[PDB]
């Protein structure tokens, strides 16, 4: 079943738009925020648009984008927190510790600027 991913940062909702831009919006009633993430392995996720069909990917520059094709850059790893919010990692760029993050202006974040402890790094699934 669907889920909205609520970022603690500014109270936005991860949004994959059809062109492939990933940002957050605070208009919970929007078509593109509905997200469906399936576990493809032990603590390994795939978040994907319920509407457009595309995927959450992060290129080798740290920019999260929407991909048509599930490809090596679509597996983020889930990791529950102490406060019960998640934290998704790029699996291709784990080494680096590049996460999924939104800024307080909506602009998605760059993997090479996601540090453990940011309020950006935390997302919390809602129905
Ligand atoms: O463009 S911004 O809007 O982000 O304007 C701020 C630029 O400064 C950064 C520097 O990078 S950082 O060292 O990793 O922080 O971040 C600092 O300011 C932003 C601005 O907020 S805003 O909502 O984007 O307008 C804060 O970003 S955010 O994560 O809060 O959204 C940074 O906070 S934090 O690092 O994430 O905790 C803040 O730095 S700090 O809190 O003092 O450490 C760049 O934003 S950043 O990449 O998100 O950090 C901004 O330039 S950038 O092109 O947006 O990256």
Domain ranges of the chain: 1-127
Q: What is the largest CA-CA distance in the chain?
A: 36
Closest atom, ligand 1, to C-alpha of 104:
23
Report yes or no: 95 and 60 within 8 Å, Cβ to Cβ: no
97: alpha, beta or left? (left if phi > 0; alpha if psi -120 to 50): left
This entry's atomic model was obtained through X-ray
The DSSP bridge partners found for residue 25 are 13
CB 120 near ligand 1, within 6 Å: yes
Would you say 3 is a known binding-site residue? yes
CATH level 3 topology of 1-127? Trefoil (Acidic Fibroblast Growth Factor, subunit A) (2.80.10)
Q: Kindly state the tokens that stand for 41.
A: 């392995």
The three-class DSSP label of residue 40 is strand
Where would I find the beta strands (DSSP E) of the chain? 4-7, 12-16, 22-25, 35-41, 44-49, 55-58, 64-67, 76-77, 89-90, 123-126
The three-class DSSP label of residue 91 is coil
Resolution (A): 2.7
Residue from 103, 110, 117, 123 whose mutation best tests the ligand 1 pocket (most atoms within 8 A of CB): 103
């Amino acid at each position: 079943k669907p889920k909205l991913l609520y970022c603690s940062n500014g109270g936005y909702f991860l949004r994959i738009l059809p062109d492939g831009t990933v940002d957050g919006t605070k208009d919970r009633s929007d078509q593109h925020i509905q997200l469906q993430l399936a576990a493809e392995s032990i603590g390994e996720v795939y978040i994907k648009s319920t509407e457009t069909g595309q995927f959450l990917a992060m290129d080798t520059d740290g920019l999260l984008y929407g991909s048509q094709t599930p490809n090596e850059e679509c597996l983020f790893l889930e990791r529950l927190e102490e406060n019960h919010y998640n934290t998704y990692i790029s699996k291709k760029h784990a080494e680096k510790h590049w996460f999924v993050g939104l800024k307080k202006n909506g602009r998605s974040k760059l993997g090479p600027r996601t540090h453990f402890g940011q309020k950006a790094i935390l997302f919390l699934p809602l129905p």
